Design a protein around this ligand. Structure first.
Ligand code: ZN
Length: 257
């Protein structure tokens, strides 16, 4: 149904998913002049040494790099979080041009793309149970700007030809998500939602302050993916981002001074 076209884009989602107009929707604009340092946040802990990637899938909206989440292999803990959150997948949002593509914004600045590492709270047993809880998910968001290449992204870029169209997948084992992280783990955090239907308000967002750089050639390969299925008219997979939503009765907290 839903997508990012003219006729089915974000501004339409509310008809089928009324929480689209909810109290804790994502993404948001992060105003660096109102987010406040919070000395209570605990250090953040990204433990990806035992991550087992399995497959990469074009779902018609983005591509997901999927992990084995049936044990505590790759987990996020610390920061704002209580307990342990297991990595299930990562995906990106990106633009048709370098001046747009991110979902979150920083002082209204749009980055070229945004990476989402999605993790679910083990206290709820499965992903599908977790998304029904306000503290069910933790999403680590990382901005991408265009400049030098990101070596740890190339293995992703190089498999994209094999998943050009909706419904295609490829084996994608032994990929190390640590190669997608910036140097610093300074972050902003707030409570919000999934940014695609069903838009559930189940996410603790953790948005890193430092972007990673990718090359123009890397991003150009993202933009050659298709929203459509095999043999259908080509619709390039670009501009698969939701714009900023109202902050409402939320505060964005900073991990850093
Ligand atoms: Zn996302």
């Amino acid at each position: 149904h839903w997508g990012y076209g003219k006729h089915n884009g974000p501004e339409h989602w509310h008809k089928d998913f009324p929480i689209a107009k909810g109290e804790r929707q994502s993404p948001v604009d992060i105003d660096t002049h109102t987010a406040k340092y919070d000395p209570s946040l605990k250090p953040l802990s990204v433990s990806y040494d035992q991550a087992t990637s399995l497959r990469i899938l074009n779902n018609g909206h983005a591509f997901n790099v999927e992990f084995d989440d049936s044990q505590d292999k790759a987990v996020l803990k610390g920061g704002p979080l209580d307990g342990t959150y297991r990595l299930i997948q990562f995906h990106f949002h990106w633009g048709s041009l370098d001046g747009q593509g991110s979902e979150h914004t920083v002082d209204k600045k749009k980055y070229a793309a945004e990476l989402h590492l999605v993790h679910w709270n083990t206290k709820y047993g499965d992903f599908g149970k977790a998304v029904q809880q306000p503290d069910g998910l933790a999403v680590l968001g990382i901005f991408l700007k265009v400049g030098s290449a990101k070596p740890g992204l190339q293995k992703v870029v190089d498999v994209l030809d094999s998943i050009k169209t909706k419904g295609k997948s490829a084996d994608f084992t032994n990929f190390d998500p640590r190669g997608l992280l910036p140097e610093s783990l300074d972050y902003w955090t707030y409570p919000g939602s999934l940014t695609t239907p069903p838009l559930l308000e189940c996410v603790t967002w953790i948005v890193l302050k430092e972007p990673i750089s990718v090359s123009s050639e890397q991003v150009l390969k993202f933009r050659k993916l298709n929203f459509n299925g095999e043999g259908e008219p080509e619709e390039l997979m670009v501009d698969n981002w939701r714009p900023a939503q109202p902050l409402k009765n939320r505060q964005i907290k900073a991990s850093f001074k």
